[PDB]
């Protein structure tokens, strides 16, 4: 279909991929660091979702350099993805409104 809509979809699939990969890499980067809690996959996936959405309750977070780098990628992917959906919705309302004004 239209670009903005295809990009929205792509952004969603790519976000899902980043969440999964991020959950995997977070554990890989955090184990070995005493005190770390982001060390099992199920909760790591929960952590990735709350980072991507930026809710960040604070029940889980990386304590190592690599874990934090993984976290930044997750945050940026989430922020970008959600922002790209907003823009797609804007491009949609703008076009429809152009019609309603017979332009």
């Amino acid at each position, epitope marked *: 279909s239209a670009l903005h809509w295809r990009a929205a979809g792509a952004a969603t699939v790519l976000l899902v991929i980043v969440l999964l990969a991020g959950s*995997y890499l977070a*554990v*890989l980067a*955090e*184990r*070995g*660091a*005493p*005190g*770390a*809690q982001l*060390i*099992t*996959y*199920p909760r790591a996936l929960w952590w990735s979702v709350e980072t991507a959405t930026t809710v960040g309750y604070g029940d889980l977070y990386p304590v190592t350099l690599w874990g934090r780098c993984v976290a930044v990628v997750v945050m940026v992917a989430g922020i970008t993805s959600f922002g790209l959906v907003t823009a797609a919705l804007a491009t949609w309302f703008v076009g429809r409104e152009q019609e309603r004004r017979g332009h």
Partner: antibody
Amino acid sequence: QVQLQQPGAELVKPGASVKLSCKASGYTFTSDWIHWVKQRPGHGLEWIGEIIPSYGRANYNEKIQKKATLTADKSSSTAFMQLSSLTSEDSAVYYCARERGDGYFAVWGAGTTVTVSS
Amino acid sequence: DILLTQSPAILSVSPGERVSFSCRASQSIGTDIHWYQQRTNGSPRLLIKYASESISGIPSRFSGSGSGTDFTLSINSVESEDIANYYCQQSNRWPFTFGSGTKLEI
């Protein structure tokens, strides 16, 4: 069927080193970690270290003296633990266990009795 | 590093009673505690995961409760086969650690 196969025993001369093996079977996932646990006769379970085969990284118990080096062979699904320059203090049963990345040791090996003697 | 205290180290119970093993963590670890049974000359065997979750193939008379720093492993109607050492293990913070263990005696 036995998910983790370990040799029953290994005799080692003080100062020498031995390479313990652990052959896995059953389901295998990229998220599996193989752990090694040391148990001296009459004592408790002491965590040695862990390794993630699909990636090859290993972590070790920082509280104890490092005597182990962990590796894994993906094709043969075998995890190894190289114990080096051992002494009588290193004599114990060494178990290997599989953790599905969710924190608990779902299964253990029968264990390998290591004896350091001349 | 999280310390897991298992006291008493030995429990003397009569056949058929309900016995309770205690496990205390040096800090709050939610429900990330797992229990293992090791009979004489046997390897450890998972009994309960995450403080209270059943494991298939394990007698229903085994149960666990607790959260935070205090955990309990219970056995309803104890019997000869339950004679062994019982260990708790935490997976809340790296590295994973084990309790000193508790022996069941009938």
